Amino acid sequence: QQEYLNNNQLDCDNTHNSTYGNVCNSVTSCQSYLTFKSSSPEYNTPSSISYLLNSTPSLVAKSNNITDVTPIITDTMVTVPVTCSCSGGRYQHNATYNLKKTGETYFSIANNTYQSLTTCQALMAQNPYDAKNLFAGDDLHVPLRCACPTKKQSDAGFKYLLTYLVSQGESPDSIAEIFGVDTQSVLDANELDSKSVVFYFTPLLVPLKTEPPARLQIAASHHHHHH
Amino acid sequence: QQEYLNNNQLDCDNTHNSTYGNVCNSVTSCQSYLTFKSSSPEYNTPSSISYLLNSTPSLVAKSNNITDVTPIITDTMVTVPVTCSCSGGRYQHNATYNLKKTGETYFSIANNTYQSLTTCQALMAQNPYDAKNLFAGDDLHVPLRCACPTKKQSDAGFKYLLTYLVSQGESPDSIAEIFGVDTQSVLDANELDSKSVVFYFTPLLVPLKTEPPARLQIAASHHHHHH
Numbered sequence: 001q002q003e004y005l006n007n008n009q010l011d012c013d014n015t016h017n018s019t020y021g022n023v024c025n026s027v028t029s030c031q032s033y034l035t036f037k038s039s040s041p042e043y044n045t046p047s048s049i050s051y052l053l054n055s056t057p058s059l060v061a062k063s064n065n066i067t068d069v070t071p072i073i074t075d076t077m078v079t080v081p082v083t084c085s086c087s088g089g090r091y092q093h094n095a096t097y098n099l100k101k102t103g104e105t106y107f108s109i110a111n112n113t114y115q116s117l118t119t120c121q122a123l124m125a126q127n128p129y130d131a132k133n134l135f136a137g138d139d140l141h142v143p144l145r146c147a148c149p150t151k152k153q154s155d156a157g158f159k160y161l162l163t164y165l166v167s168q169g170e171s172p173d174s175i176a177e178i179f180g181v182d183t184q185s186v187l188d189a190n191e192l193d194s195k196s197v198v199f200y201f202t203p204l205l206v207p208l209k210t211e212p213p214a215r216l217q218i219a220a221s222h223h224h225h226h227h
Numbered sequence: 228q229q230e231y232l233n234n235n236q237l238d239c240d241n242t243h244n245s246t247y248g249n250v251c252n253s254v255t256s257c258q259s260y261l262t263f264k265s266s267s268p269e270y271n272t273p274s275s276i277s278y279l280l281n282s283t284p285s286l287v288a289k290s291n292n293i294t295d296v297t298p299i300i301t302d303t304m305v306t307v308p309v310t311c312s313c314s315g316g317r318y319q320h321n322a323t324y325n326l327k328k329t330g331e332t333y334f335s336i337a338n339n340t341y342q343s344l345t346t347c348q349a350l351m352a353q354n355p356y357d358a359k360n361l362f363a364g365d366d367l368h369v370p371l372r373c374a375c376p377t378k379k380q381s382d383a384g385f386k387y388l389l390t391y392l393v394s395q396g397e398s399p400d401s402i403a404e405i406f407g408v409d410t411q412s413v414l415d416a417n418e419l420d421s422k423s424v425v426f427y428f429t430p431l432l433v434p435l436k437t438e439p440p441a442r443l444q445i446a447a448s449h450h451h452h453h454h
């Protein structure tokens with residue numbers, strides 16, 4: 001279990017502990033997964049997505065059952081294998097981001113560019129620039145959100161945790177169905193109860209019993225489960 | 228100086244020594260440069276070109292005065308900074324290539340995919356697969372052609388050698404003009420005389436006194452030299 005961000009990352013003056021990253025509460029390093037929606041023209045190939053997220057094109061390609069060079073249709077959510085490890089009491093996966101245009105902000109980088117896989121707070125904590133003093137060409141340390149299964153989750157058969165980017169209309173139930181896991185397991189993973197609200201544009205942990213499906217959209221089909 | 232390939236790389240039964248790579252005749256490692264023409268949709272960003280050639284997107288971006296994510300217009304020749312080092316008596320820059328489609332061949336990979344930055348012979352020498360037994364998913368060790376300045380070239384003020392992909396219509400004279408070096412220096416670098424023919428689709432070494440220009444096409448303009 002990790003605390004749910006609960007939209008604290010939208011207010012960059014908020015200092016709730018969850019915004020600084022998942023807590024190191026299990027093994028020091030593990031295999032994990034991120035998710036990311038292809039964005040054209042900058043982040044729509046295994047190469048460019050892997051560059052942004054600090055993965056490899058081969059791992060992206062294998063996780064999605066595509067080649068390492070074919071373009072990914074815009075808005076397709078892909079899986080991105082990453083190593084998650086503990087740093088400073090937090091689980092994270094480090095990446096680097098060079099600002100492209102002056103006018104980018106810690107919030108636009110966390111919420112737009114990285115699609116909520118990091119937070120403005122964790123960017124601010126781990127970088128030297130004041131929020132109002134960012135320029136094109138500045139390099140940022142990007143602490144991407146991931147976690148490793150706790151002992152209790154491992155004992156229940158979860159091999160990995162996946163950082164799932166939630167879209168409007170989804171719910172814990174519908175997300176759990178994509179991955180073939182019980183809803184309660186998604187609730188437990190995020191310290192939520194069955195009436196808790198989950199927001200779109202806020203990442204959610206999904207515990208996995210096996211590697212994720214290669215195509216998430218069709219994995220959401222009712223005909224791809226319960227038969 | 229290095230021997231000119233002289234189109235030996237078009238006949239993959241040819242075993243001329245030049246086809247196995249530039250010879251290790253100077254320092255064991257150095258900064259060097261490749262060139263590459265953007266190709267859409269697979270190899271038209273700093274990420275995808277760097278993946279193919281084993282560079283970094285940041286080095287590609289800086290060498291070309293572009294950002295690390297903006298698309299490169301198809302057929303634009305870009306500079307690609309690489310480390311060149313000696314292996315097995317040859318200078319080369321190692322990359323890795325996973326075949327995408329069964330039907331790719333050592334020659335199509337060397338001449339088309341890698342735009343003549345390697346040779347079928349060097350691929351064959353450094354990989355285990357018979358020419359007629361290549362499949363999608365096979366990984367190849369790719370020995371990209373580069374060299375380090377000899378002592379004589381360094382003493383003349385050349386800091387780097389660049390592997391230039393020659394296009395139809397060019398000549399030693401016109402290529403030397405792009406880089407602000409004497410024609411004789413390009414001839415010497417490739418063991419050519421002033422009447423030697425240079426072929427398009429065959430890489431040529433260009434000795435450089437400074438980092439290459441950031442935009443090669445306009446560097447070919449008569450108004451960008453001799454005034």
Ligand SMILES: CC(=O)N[C@@H]1[C@@H](O)[C@H](O[C@@H]2O[C@H](CO)[C@@H](O[C@@H]3O[C@H](CO)[C@@H](O[C@@H]4O[C@H](CO)[C@@H](O[C@@H]5O[C@H](CO)[C@@H](O[C@@H]6O[C@H](CO)[C@@H](O[C@@H]7O[C@H](CO)[C@@H](O[C@@H]8O[C@H](CO)[C@@H](O)[C@H](O)[C@H]8NC(C)=O)[C@H](O)[C@H]7NC(C)=O)[C@H](O)[C@H]6NC(C)=O)[C@H](O)[C@H]5NC(C)=O)[C@H](O)[C@H]4NC(C)=O)[C@H](O)[C@H]3NC(C)=O)[C@H](O)[C@H]2NC(C)=O)[C@@H](CO)O[C@H]1O
Pocket residue numbers: none
């Ligand atoms: C997400 C996650 O991971 N969550 C976790 C949760 O899943 C987890 O929760 C746990 O989950 C588990 C998995 O689902 C779950 O496991 C299940 O548990 C079940 C409950 O234990 C279990 O079911 C068991 O299964 C066993 C084995 O098959 C069955 O056992 C059989 O029972 C039979 C009876 O029904 C027995 O038989 C009887 O035997 C007696 C003798 O032994 C016999 O008695 C004689 O009878 C004669 C007459 O018939 C008597 O003779 C008479 O005597 C009188 C008096 O003198 C005379 O007057 C008379 O004349 C004379 N008559 C004659 C003719 O001579 C004689 O005296 C008697 N003798 C004696 C000594 O008394 C009876 O006749 C027999 N009866 C019958 C009908 O045959 C049989 O022996 C026995 N077999 C064995 C091998 O032992 C049980 O029935 C069954 N129980 C039930 C309720 O179904 C499941 O198998 C489990 N599944 C699995 C996969 O393991 C966990 O329970 C669950 N836990 C909880 C807490 O929920 C939690 C926790 O781990 O963790 C989460 O994280």
Ligand SMILES: CC(=O)N[C@@H]1[C@@H](O)[C@H](O[C@@H]2O[C@H](CO)[C@@H](O[C@@H]3O[C@H](CO)[C@@H](O[C@@H]4O[C@H](CO)[C@@H](O[C@@H]5O[C@H](CO)[C@@H](O[C@@H]6O[C@H](CO)[C@@H](O[C@@H]7O[C@H](CO)[C@@H](O[C@@H]8O[C@H](CO)[C@@H](O)[C@H](O)[C@H]8NC(C)=O)[C@H](O)[C@H]7NC(C)=O)[C@H](O)[C@H]6NC(C)=O)[C@H](O)[C@H]5NC(C)=O)[C@H](O)[C@H]4NC(C)=O)[C@H](O)[C@H]3NC(C)=O)[C@H](O)[C@H]2NC(C)=O)[C@@H](CO)O[C@H]1O
Pocket residue numbers: none
């Ligand atoms: C790609 C690559 O890298 N490639 C490489 C190649 O580049 C490379 O090739 C090399 O490249 C180099 C760079 O280009 C190149 O360097 C150039 O080399 C040039 C040649 O050496 C050089 O030019 C030199 O420069 C020097 C210095 O400026 C000049 O020197 C001056 O010369 C003057 C004359 O012209 C001298 O003066 C005279 O002085 C005498 C006394 O010393 C004086 O004599 C008295 O005269 C009086 C009367 O006037 C006499 O008195 C009379 O006496 C009689 C008899 O008794 C009496 O009867 C009479 O009465 C009495 N009269 C009176 C009035 O009293 C008296 O007796 C005399 N005294 C004596 C003792 O005799 C004269 O009068 C003076 N004359 C004048 C006119 O003033 C002056 O002293 C001298 N100055 C100095 C400081 O020494 C030269 O002229 C000049 N030469 C030329 C030909 O131009 C360049 O400077 C170099 N450039 C650079 C950048 O360095 C290399 O040559 C080239 N190499 C090759 C091989 O090609 C290669 C190789 O490295 O490698 C490649 O890889």
Ligand SMILES: *[C@@H]1O[C@H](CO)[C@@H](O[C@@H]2O[C@H](CO)[C@@H](O)[C@H](O)[C@H]2NC(C)=O)[C@H](O)[C@H]1NC(C)=O
Pocket residue numbers: 085087088094126141
């Ligand atoms: C991920 O980034 C963190 C920094 O946020 C790295 O931890 C630092 O590592 C350096 C060594 O390079 C130490 O000097 C610092 O003390 C570390 N800081 C903290 C807070 O632990 C961490 O090593 C990085 N991990 C990976 C796998 O790259």
Ligand SMILES: *[C@@H]1O[C@H](CO)[C@@H](O[C@@H]2O[C@H](CO)[C@@H](O)[C@H](O)[C@H]2NC(C)=O)[C@H](O)[C@H]1NC(C)=O
Pocket residue numbers: 010111112115201
């Ligand atoms: C955070 O990032 C998301 C995208 O991941 C932003 O959503 C976009 O907002 C614009 C409105 O300006 C819409 O045109 C886009 O279509 C939205 N994208 C999606 C995928 O719906 C969002 O505005 C950003 N900010 C906040 C506060 O959430």
Ligand SMILES: *[C@@H]1O[C@H](CO)[C@@H](O[C@@H]2O[C@H](CO)[C@@H](O)[C@H](O)[C@H]2NC(C)=O)[C@H](O)[C@H]1NC(C)=O
Pocket residue numbers: 312314315321353368
């Ligand atoms: C480039 O590739 C060559 C192989 O073509 C590498 O040289 C080999 O390195 C391994 C160690 O990993 C040795 O066991 C082999 O004996 C080497 N072979 C030869 C022919 O020297 C070389 O190390 C690579 N260079 C870089 C910088 O990655």
Ligand SMILES: *[C@@H]1O[C@H](CO)[C@@H](O[C@@H]2O[C@H](CO)[C@@H](O)[C@H](O)[C@H]2NC(C)=O)[C@H](O)[C@H]1NC(C)=O
Pocket residue numbers: 237338339342428
């Ligand atoms: C080697 O690779 C080059 C491209 O780098 C090939 O040239 C192309 O050939 C086709 C003909 O089938 C033309 O339609 C293309 O426009 C050519 N490209 C360029 C840039 O001119 C060439 O065919 C390959 N083979 C040989 C033997 O050179």
Ligand SMILES: *[C@@H]1O[C@H](CO)[C@@H](O)[C@H](O)[C@H]1NC(C)=O
Pocket residue numbers: 061062064065066067
């Ligand atoms: C995709 O999946 C199939 C198995 O269903 C496999 O045989 C094929 O090689 C895969 N392709 C890629 C590009 O991963």
Ligand SMILES: *[C@@H]1O[C@H](CO)[C@@H](O)[C@H](O)[C@H]1NC(C)=O
Pocket residue numbers: 288289291292293294
């Ligand atoms: C491109 O070159 C100019 C110098 O002419 C420099 O100021 C600018 O930042 C450069 N842009 C990039 C993206 O490299």
